[PDB]
Point group: C5
Chain length 52, copies 5
């Protein structure tokens, strides 16, 4: 129980996410669009591999 509580606290303690302050929504856009494009890039590679 206390171990779980500490584990949860430890997990949160371990967890950390940081982005630009002024350019926050810019960073969020980098985080979103690149992730999508990167997924597509990787997908196209699979399309290319299959096609090959």
């Amino acid at each position: 129980m206390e171990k779980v509580q500490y584990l949860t606290r430890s997990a949160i303690r371990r967890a950390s996410t940081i982005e630009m302050p002024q350019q926050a929504r810019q960073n969020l856009q980098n985080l979103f669009i690149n992730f999508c494009l990167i997924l597509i890039c990787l997908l196209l590679i699979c399309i290319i591999v299959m096609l090959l």
Copy 2:
């Protein structure tokens, strides 16, 4: 009638959309471009499934 009016008010009351103030059009861009990229990603998956 009054029920409909209240329902409309309740619907509006329930409705809520929020984005970054300074980075508003950035957030709108995140909202627009990611949605379109995400659609392409999903549509590439359809192509991939159909290819497979």
Copy 3:
């Protein structure tokens, strides 16, 4: 002639385009990239239909 002049003025009067001031080039980017994506999204659908 005067009718054409008024028509031109009327057309200009009817014409109106507005975007965010501070986030102008952001809005222009939304206007440009989404249009390109959205076109491709629609063009992927054409490929999907043709694939189907």
Copy 4:
């Protein structure tokens, strides 16, 4: 020689590129990303023509 020098000066004089000041890297992003998207759109049309 002097003609070439003047021609170089004239070429530079003719040459002119302008983008938003505050939204410079935004404009550069519009310039880069849209160009690449536009290329993909055109290249999808080539795929579509070839699909048909």
Copy 5:
């Protein structure tokens, strides 16, 4: 050893990366998104070449 240390220092000395200050995360987005799109464009060309 000292040569390696100097080489490391020289490598760092040679190494240099610069982007817009205010439009930093914008520049990082240009750096990320264009790189992905450019890769996709190049990968579409591969698809086009194969298809042809």
